[PDB]
Structures are given as structure tokens and as C-alpha cells.
Design an enzyme around this catalytic site. Structure first.
Site: not given
Ligand SMILES: CC(=O)N1C[C@@H](CO)[C@@H]2Oc3c(F)cccc3[C@@H]21
Ligand SMILES: CC(=O)N1C[C@@H](CO)[C@@H]2Oc3c(F)cccc3[C@@H]21
Length: 282
Positions: A181, A215-222, A262
């Protein structure tokens, strides 16, 4: 500089935040006018994360062709990816329309539906074989075929049917279920194992449309997923693998979607993943 020793040099000097801020300063800025039209407000999860106009995926619709999704095309590596936000209650039908129209084989999901006690994306696939989903706005049907639950990730086989033409296709859902998390994983080993499972399925290969990753925003983990994949492929293709410059690759990818990676912790984790991955490949 090489990667592994540049890495230790940033650790010993504690300068990850300064390196990451340099990337943010040098990153491309292109217009995202379609994303900001008033009619698209409920199609965006976050007001500060938008697809550039030049690289956005268009839905094959004449009313409204907008989805928060971007085509990342890596020319030297010969890989393409679609990066998108986690679907919203009013965009789950658009999401599967995109998968269909772009001829994707696989969907890569790097978040849980609920994290930190809040919803991070809609429940957009069926959880039981006998309870299929119908998306009436885009005329698609989606059925769960099988599910394999492992300790760090789950793989699902799904059937997507275009109800207009009665054509069907098999889609693979690769769900990484153990990203914490807060922060990043302590070791990259399970993330790399997951990447290799996606590769082995054919979902990243040229005989299919681009993989859809979110992912949630599509920039960090993605961003971490596609950055690690592309860097490892370049190290296999080139005569001199130590010439691969992860900061330069990230800036190339940021020509196609804003904000990839991010935090400075995500940048350090990406270095770690490529470093460890390059040893296993050989
Ligand atoms: C399950 C299985 O035997 N196959 C055949 C493979 C190609 O010959 C496919 O790869 C996957 C996969 F990665 C996940 C799920 C089902 C498949 C298919
Ligand atoms: C399982 C697998 O095929 N791979 C590929 C490696 C990258 O080449 C990944 O990283 C590790 C690792 F450090 C240990 C163990 C398995 C792995 C993953």
C-alpha cells in the site's frame, strides 16, 4: 556511466531526489486538449494525469472517442505498450472496447481494487464463471474461463465477445496482487518473475496488438513495468549492454505519456529491477 555502479554512487551520496527532479525538469510537455474538454470530466480519474493528444488511443466511435490511455512506441526495442488509468464506473465499457479494437492479447493490472481503504479502480472483470458481464454501451460480453491464484500474482483466462459480430477472443489477465500500500517492494524478485510470466504468454509479442497495462493512475507502477521490460530487451539486443541508459529510456517514454515513475523510490526500484534482471537473463 554504467548502471550498477551509478546505482551505488547515488546510494552512497543519497541523491535520488535530485536525480529524479532532474528527470521531471527535462520531461516533455505536449498538449492534452481533448482530455480537458468539459464533456470528458467523468472519464478522468485524476485531474493532473492526462494523455497527450499526439499519442492518445482513440475509440472507434463518432460520438465521443476519448479514453484516458496512451500508446508508448519504443522504436529501437521494437515494443509497444498501451498505458491507461484503472477503469471508472462509467468507463468499464470503453476499456473493453479499446482492448477489442487494438487487438490486445493481455491486460496487466498492478493494483488491488481497494488499497488504503479507498477504491482504486472498478471491479471490471467477472469473479465467477457462471456470472458473466455485459457492457451495453459498447455491446461486449465478458466471461471468466479459468483462474490460477499464486502467492504474488493471479492469472485469469477471459473470453471477450463482440455481440455485434459474434466474434470471440481469448484475453489473458495478469494481476500482480502484492505491491505494498505504501512504498515499493523490498526485493524486485517477484516483480521480475511476474514480468517473465507475461513475456512467456505471448502478450508482449509483435503478432498481437499492444499489451494494456494499468494501475490506479497508469503512470507509476505501470511506468516501472514498461521501463524495466524495455531496458532488459535493449541489453539483449545491443553489442554493449552497459550502454543502456535507464534515465534516457525513461525520458523517451515520457514523450508519449506524462509522469511515468511517480517517486524517487520508484526510480530506485526500477534500477534495482533492471540490475538483478540482467543477471538472470544470462
Ligand atoms: C495454458 C496453456 O497451455 N496455453 C498454451 C500456451 C501456448 O502454447 C498459452 O500460454 C498461456 C498462458 F500464458 C496463460 C494461460 C494459458 C496459456 C496458453
Ligand atoms: C523467473 C524468471 O524467468 N525471471 C527472469 C529474471 C530476469 O532475467 C527475473 O529476476 C529473477 C531473479 F532475480 C531470481 C529468480 C527469478 C527471476 C526472474
Amino acid at each position: 556511466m554504467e548502471m550498477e555502479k551509478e546505482f551505488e554512487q547515488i546510494d552512497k551520496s543519497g541523491s535520488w531526489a535530485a536525480i529524479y527532479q532532474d528527470i521531471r525538469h527535462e520531461a516533455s510537455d505536449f498538449p492534452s486538449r481533448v482530455a480537458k474538454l468539459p464533456k470528458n470530466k467523468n472519464r478522468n480519474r485524476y485531474r493532473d494525469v492526462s494523455p497527450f493528444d499526439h499519442s492518445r488511443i482513440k475509440l472507434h466511435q463518432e460520438d465521443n472517442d476519448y479514453i484516458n490511455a496512451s500508446l508508448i512506441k519504443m522504436e529501437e526495442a521494437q515494443r509497444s505498450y498501451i498505458l491507461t488509468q484503472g477503469p471508472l464506473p462509467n468507463t468499464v465499457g470503453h476499456f473493453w472496447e479499446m482492448v477489442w479494437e487494438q487487438k490486445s492479447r493481455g491486460v496487466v493490472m498492478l493494483n488491488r481494487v481497494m488499497e488504503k481503504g479507498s477504491l482504486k479502480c472498478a471491479q471490471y472483470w467477472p469473479q465467477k464463471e457462471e456470472k458473466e458481464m455485459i457492457f451495453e454501451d459498447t455491446n461486449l460480453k465478458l466471461t471468466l474461463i479459468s483462474e490460477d491464484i499464486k502467492s504474488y500474482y493471479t492469472v485469469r483466462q477471459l473470453e471477450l465477445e463482440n455481440l455485434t459480430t459474434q466474434e470471440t477472443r481469448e484475453i489473458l489477465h495478469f494481476h500482480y496482487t502484492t505491491w505494498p500500500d505504501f512504498g515499493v517492494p523490498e526485493s524486485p524478485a517477484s516483480f521480475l518473475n511476474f514480468l517473465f510470466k507475461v513475456r512467456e504468454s505471448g502478450s508482449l509479442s509483435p503478432e498481437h496488438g499492444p499489451v494494456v497495462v494499468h494501475c490506479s493512475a497508469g503512470i507509476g507502477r505501470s511506468g516501472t513495468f514498461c521501463l524495466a521490460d524495455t531496458c532488459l530487451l535493449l541489453m539483449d539486443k545491443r553489442k554493449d549492454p552497459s550502454s543502456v541508459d535507464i534515465k534516457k529510456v525513461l525520458l523517451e517514454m515520457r514523450k508519449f505519456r506524462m509522469g511515468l515513475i511517480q517517486t524517487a523510490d520508484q526510480l530506485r526500484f526500477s534500477y534495482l529491477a533492471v540490475i538483478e534482471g540482467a543477471k538472470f537473463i544470462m
